[PDB]
């Protein structure tokens, strides 16, 4: 309990803001997340006082560049406990991340015959590239079924994966159900199988410690916009055996170690995953989040959200004709529907009170299928929320189910 | 004559600093751009008022957000003069751009028998792709010569373009040579023989007006960093009809359809080839640049680079024992080497002077290779660059020559 949650709010400016004449109240950060001033100020003074092209020590800000690009590279190795900065790719965000472990050792290591198995609560982002690769390939998409409460059974792994699986993608924290995947028991799974294992942290890493030795996961995924960092950037983590025998996924400058007219050979890791000018500024900041996070605490952050969890869990528990998708045990989020009223419907009411929630499929549509619903609405928090914005949710939702009962048989009166 | 050079740089605060003791001299544009007060603030403003992930209208800084980013798309089409927004997608790069074309058009469109023409003085990021991509199919890869003064001639692309080629992949501009290549004569050569033309506009984009529909440009990409825009943000413009037969590069939400377990389709143009959470603050951050460079005027820009550029070569052409690569109409850059004297050892001499150019072989080793010479430094200019500043180069040029012989033979004496 030693965190301050007003202390943390102050440094937040966008929180600090009416909407439609009501305090905002942010419920959307499993969407993005909102960054302190740490962050934007890291970003300020790169463009104020050392931008420059990096990996060349040729003038004193390209070297000071270069010094605060690979620095926040360190910065994010030991945040996930990577054994070298040579595991440690910066790419464009979690997608790409699973999109270059789909392009370089999916379509190079699947035959026919080849399995790659994932699961029903995956996000698109670990889907397509799955399917697209597979098809490229002629492998096989197998899927793990979820148990009734939204969670996966270790047996249910041992039976999917096979002798034939080579690659075991799943997320390790859904952004709708808030499951908390048993990622080191499936990584073990996999491993037994001959297959390696791909993980889905873009939910995960913002809110609990990541431990990628613990985990003993080949790949992990992540995206600075999820947790107080600049959008646009994310970290491609891969084992230092895999990723030498990766071909890589971009072709440019800053990749190549000679230029032939013909042929060309590549840097050493990681730069071999890094083509053209990088994301310099974002890196940085990326850095100064982890930066951040890590002086308030991870730990720290994971039990706010699980005290946060539980309080709406029971919050909720509270109103009639709401269903909530999920396990009782999950993370900061709460996926949602009112019975009768449309999910976009209660977002946009709740908009009007200054409430920000997310409405749709959660980029989930089979996650939706199996949930047999069309839509839903969620509510996810981060380490800036309080059990007050909690409540006003609550109310907002209760008014909400009222106002639509109110209309509802209004003009039934008609 | 319109231009203010004083009160551009009063806008950029990273031109207002002293290195080793000396006042700032930056000449290192090509390489990387500064940034005036007004991108750094949007991205400030982004940050601190309306940050929210994009697409999908349900609360209000959602809604902020997307019409940032769409309005920065829109943005972009106005300034290379686009005919629609679905040409218009944004990227990590350049680099990522080219890439993109050589993996979803080349692979798609290339057999056996089929040419890709490029020339020697073309980037890496226009190189390595093409390479990749006519070994995946069976191609081959032809260069365009160059002539004496590093140009280009019509009558060399009407005998390298033939019958067989499908791709001609050619810099807009040289970083190096500072040629100005004749984009809109290759572009209808390459017409004439049943090509399209790829053109790599990093360099020329932030320097000079692009009209994408005068030059009849089937493929164009620019680098944000290079336009005094943020880091990590480019943008690939494509022919409508060319980008919808394309399939897309990267897989994942926001630029699905439909989504089964084994089967997907696609968003319309342009968010088919926008995987993930975009690139929301840099892209909004390349609008106010591109508003900023807008309220100059580029033809005002690039009159100064010329003045500048003009001015340069002169007082090069006054230093003995320098060598200048390239023709005498060009951009706003010098490419040299000191006779006995490593381009290395100028850029640190000239660094403890203050002033920052670059040394090493600028992404372009067959171009190193054809000049015959292993390294070159670059003295490169924007519209915050002054005469005084190429004074001060050549001056100190002029010191390192000096300071170079007096210390040879004062160990000679030894
Ligand atoms: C002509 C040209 N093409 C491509 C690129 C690379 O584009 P991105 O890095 O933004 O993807 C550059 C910038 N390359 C500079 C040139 O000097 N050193 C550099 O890194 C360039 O000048
Ligand atoms: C579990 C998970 N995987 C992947 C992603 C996408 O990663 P990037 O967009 O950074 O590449 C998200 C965020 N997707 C959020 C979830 O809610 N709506 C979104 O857009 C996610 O929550």
């Known amino acids: 309990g030693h965190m301050n949650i007003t202390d943390i709010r102050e440094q937040f400016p966008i929180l600090h803001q009416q909407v439609n004449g009501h305090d905002l109240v942010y419920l959307d950060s499993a969407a993005t997340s909102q960054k302190p001033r740490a962050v934007i100020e890291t970003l300020d003074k790169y463009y104020n006082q050392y931008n420059s092209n990096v990996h060349r020590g040729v003038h004193t800000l390209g070297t000071r560049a270069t ?66 690769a597979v098809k490229a390939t002629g492998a096989t998409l197998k899927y793990i079924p979820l148990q009734e409460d939204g969670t996966i059974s270790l047996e249910d792994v041992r039976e999917t994966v096979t002798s034939n699986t080579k690659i075991v993608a799943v997320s390790h924290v859904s952004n709708v159900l808030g499951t908390v995947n048993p990622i ?8 037994d199988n001959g297959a390696v294992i791909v993980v889905d942290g873009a939910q995960s890493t913002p809110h609990m410690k990541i431990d990628v030795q613990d985990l003993d996961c080949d790949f992990f995924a992540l995206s600075s916009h999820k947790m107080c960092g600049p959008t646009g950037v994310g970290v491609l983590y891969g084992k230092k055996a895999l990723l030498e025998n ?10 190549i170690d000679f230029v032939g007219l013909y042929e060309s050979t590549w840097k050493e890791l990681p730069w071999k995953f890094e083509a053209g000018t990088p994301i310099i500024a974002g890196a940085i900041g990326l850095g100064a989040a982890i930066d951040f996070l890590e002086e308030i605490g991870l730990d720290e952050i994971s039990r706010h959200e699980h005290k946060l969890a539980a309080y709406a869990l029971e919050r909720f528990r509270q109103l009639d004709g709401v269903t909530v998708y999920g396990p009782e045990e999950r993370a900061g989020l709460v996926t949602f529907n009112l019975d009768d009223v449309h999910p976009h419907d209660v977002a946009t009411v709740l908009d009007a009170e200054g409430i920000a929630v997310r409405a749709g499929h959660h980029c989930a549509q089979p996650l939706m299928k199996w949930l047999d619903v069309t839509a839903t609405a969620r509510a996810s928090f981060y380490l800036y929320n309080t059990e007050e914005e909690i409540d006003k949710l609550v109310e907002a ?4 189910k009222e106002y639509f009962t109110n209309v509802f048989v209004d003009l039934e009166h008609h």
């Open 67 to 132: 010094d605060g690009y690979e620095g926040a590279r360190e910065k994010v190795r030991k945040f996930i406990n990577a054994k070298s900065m040579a595991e440690i790719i910066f790419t464009k965000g979690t997608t790409t991340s699973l999109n270059m472990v789909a392009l370089s050792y999916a379509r190079a290591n699947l035959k026919p015959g080849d399995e790659v198995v994932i699961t029903y609560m995956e996000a698109h982002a670990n889907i397509i590239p799955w399917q697209q």
């Open 397 to 400: 939702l209760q008014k909400t």
């Open 246 to 255: 990766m071909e890589p996924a971009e072709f440019g400058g800053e990749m």
């Open 184 to 191: 080191k028991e499936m990584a073990k799974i996999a491993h």
